[PDB]
Design a binder for this molecule. Structure first.
Ligand SMILES: Cc1cc2nc3c(=O)[nH]c(=O)nc-3n(C[C@H](O)[C@H](O)[C@H](O)COP(=O)(O)OP(=O)(O)OC[C@H]3O[C@@H](n4cnc5c(N)ncnc54)[C@H](O)[C@@H]3O)c2cc1C
Ligand SMILES: NC(=O)c1ccc[n+]([C@@H]2O[C@H](COP(=O)([O-])OP(=O)(O)OC[C@H]3O[C@@H](n4cnc5c(N)ncnc54)[C@H](OP(=O)(O)O)[C@@H]3O)[C@@H](O)[C@H]2O)c1
Length: 523
């Protein structure tokens, strides 16, 4: 019941963690709440669930064999394909034997003298670890909003977070969807394909850009696969972990014709990359406005009814402030005869009854209600974890006035503890597979550094975290991501905004210099 490393989570990050640590001779125990590997790709399985970043980028690079061997069927893989990929990865590297599934980590307590972590679970596991590595992911489900009389409704209630494995038939059914974030946006067009009638209950419109999905052919695949190494080098040095860069010139320093041409290009590629089309797009409000206009025109042209197009248009929000969603035929869905967009600002939901949804304005008879829930704060999974460090001081207490980290990898009072791809790191702002590889590699090197020195532990110094907190604050203040009610907030803007390449370089040089800003512990 003791191991070198305990890993929390078996999604992209935990799976690579198991592989990397084991390869270096460390014994590893992983714990996963879900019944299988995959993380978000295991449990978030509503129809239309799909990644934001091209699959060739949003995939592992640690294995040349896997890169050559695996064939992505399209530009943006759906979750069943990403799940299949991750299951294949766990097969190839024999990861499952070190994972205990259906097992939720509840507490981790530092033994200050021994420099070890006692990790406890809801299934009665109690294990001892030199290093505790939390790979619990950036996205956890929001609580189902309290609707009165929900318990009274007699039709089916389906949650996008807990989608039935064997699916749900919408044929013949009157369906209501509450929620227009990414879960609602991705499932809506698919729901509308087989539903008798679909009502979308929208409170706040969000920005969405087409995926523009193409099935990747043979001659395309082999040519991208032939140039994979170079694509990875460009990705690892870039702002967002993909082989793309913003325009050389600024948005306002270019002509109106050329501005449309750059925007038109990035619309085709589609996704998150549209947000970073010009260098100052997320920096300067006026440059942002030009992207908002381009977006509004595109949507006005796709949606037949002018008033619906207006209703689908987000009001006084910077485009790309909140993360832009990626869709497959979402706005085209509203041209159908069998879909209605309900403005909840006009007529809010006041409850449900036996037969459907009650708004202030009208009652809606429904056979099925789909709760397209959103995702909790970036720290949501960590907040379900009781982590007791030096002095019996909890992580939740340390983070009360905001997350405090050095590089996202060190916290004073929490030695030999590593939170992956969370606050103080680029996190959701970068390609997370590559980001996971970066963090897992960094942790492994740090462990190797300590083992070579005969040292017991490593810990963020108070001075270094304070410098980093302010460094994060400084990069954040110029950004339109630091919006009044931004999800990246907790006040403290949580992710590192400098860029992924910049951050890689910062943490690599820290390591190379004998871990400045960390204390090496003999313990
Ligand atoms: C529709 C959608 C599309 C996305 N597209 C992209 C994209 O294109 N690019 C991108 O970079 N990111 C994308 N993301 C973000 C995605 O969340 C991350 O890429 C991904 O989750 C990183 O994997 P992870 O292993 O860090 O975390 P996760 O996938 O969340 O895995 C963490 C695992 O830890 C488990 N866990 C948590 N707490 C505990 C505990 N206490 N005990 C035991 N187990 C625990 C969870 O059950 C989960 O299985 C997308 C997310 C969604 C929902
Ligand atoms: N690829 C990625 O990395 C990725 C993917 C998804 C999300 N994210 C991140 O996570 C954050 C949140 O994403 P999200 O899509 O979960 O949040 P979201 O965009 O707010 O989606 C939730 C939806 O449900 C609606 N809703 C919630 N409670 C309601 C109620 N009581 N009545 C009616 N409607 C209600 C919300 O409306 P209101 O807006 O009016 O509350 C919203 O439309 C984003 O900012 C993004 O940074 C990242």
């Amino acid at each position: 019941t003791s191991y070198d490393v305990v890993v929390v989570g078996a999604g992209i990050a935990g799976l690579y963690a198991i592989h990397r640590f084991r390869s270096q001779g460390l014994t590893v125990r992983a714990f996963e709440a879900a019944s299988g590997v995959g993380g978000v790709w295991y449990w978030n399985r509503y129809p239309g669930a799909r990644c934001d970043v091209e699959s060739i980028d949003y995939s592992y690079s640690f294995s040349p064999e896997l890169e050559q061997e695996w064939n992505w069927s399209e530009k943006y893989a759906t979750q069943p394909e990403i799940l299949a990929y991750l299951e294949h990865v766990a097969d190839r590297f024999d990861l499952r034997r070190d994972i205990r599934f259906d097992t939720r980590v509840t507490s981790a307590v530092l033994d200050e003298e021994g420099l070890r972590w006692t990790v406890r679970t809801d299934r009665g596991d109690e294990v001892s670890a030199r290093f505790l590595v939390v790979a619990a992911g950036p996205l956890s489900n929001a609580n189902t909003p309290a609707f009165d009389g929900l318990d009274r409704f007699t039709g089916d209630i389906v949650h996008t977070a807990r989608w039935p494995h064997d699916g749900v038939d919408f044929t013949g059914k009157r369906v209501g969807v509450i929620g227009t974030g990414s879960s609602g946006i991705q499932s809506i067009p698919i729901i509308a394909e087989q539903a008798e009638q679909l009502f979308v209950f929208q409170r706040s419109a969000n920005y969405s850009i087409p995926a523009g999905n193409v099935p990747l052919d043979d001659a395309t695949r082999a040519e991208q696969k032939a140039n994979y190494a170079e694509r990875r080098r460009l990705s690892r040095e870039s702002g967002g972990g993909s082989p793309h860069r913003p325009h050389p010139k600024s948005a306002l320093e270019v002509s109106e014709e050329e501005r449309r041409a750059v925007y038109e290009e990035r619309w085709k590629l589609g996704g998150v990359l549209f947000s970073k089309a010009f260098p100052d797009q997320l920096t300067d409000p006026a440059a942002n406005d030009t992207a908002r206009a381009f977006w509004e025109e595109k949507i006005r042209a796709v949606v037949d009814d002018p008033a619906v197009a207006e209703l689908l248009t987000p009001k006084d929000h910077a485009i790309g402030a909140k993360r832009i969603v990626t869709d497959s035929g979402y706005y085209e869905t509203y041209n159908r005869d069998n879909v209605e967009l309900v403005d909840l600002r006009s007529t809010p939901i006041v409850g449900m009854d036996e037969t459907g949804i009650v708004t202030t304005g009208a009652h809606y008879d429904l056979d099925m209600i789909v709760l397209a829930t959103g995702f909790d704060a970036m720290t949501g999974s960590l907040d379900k974890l009781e982590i007791v460090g030096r002095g019996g001081r909890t992580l939740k207490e340390t983070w009360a006035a905001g997350p405090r980290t050095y590089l996202g990898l060190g916290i004073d009072g929490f030695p030999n503890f590593f939170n992956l791809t969370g606050p103080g790191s680029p996190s959701v702002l970068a390609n997370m597979v590559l980001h996971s590889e970066l963090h897992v590699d960094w942790v492994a090197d740090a462990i190797a550094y300590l083992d070579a020195r005969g040292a017991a532990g490593i810990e963020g110094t108070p001075e270094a975290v304070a410098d980093w907190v302010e460094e994060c604050r400084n990069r954040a203040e110029a950004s339109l991501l630091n919006s009044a009610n931004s999800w990246y907030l907790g006040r403290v803007f949580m992710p590192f905004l400098g860029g992924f390449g910049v951050y890689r370089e910062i943490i690599t040089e820290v390591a190379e210099s004998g871990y400045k800003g960390f204390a090496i512990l003999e313990g």
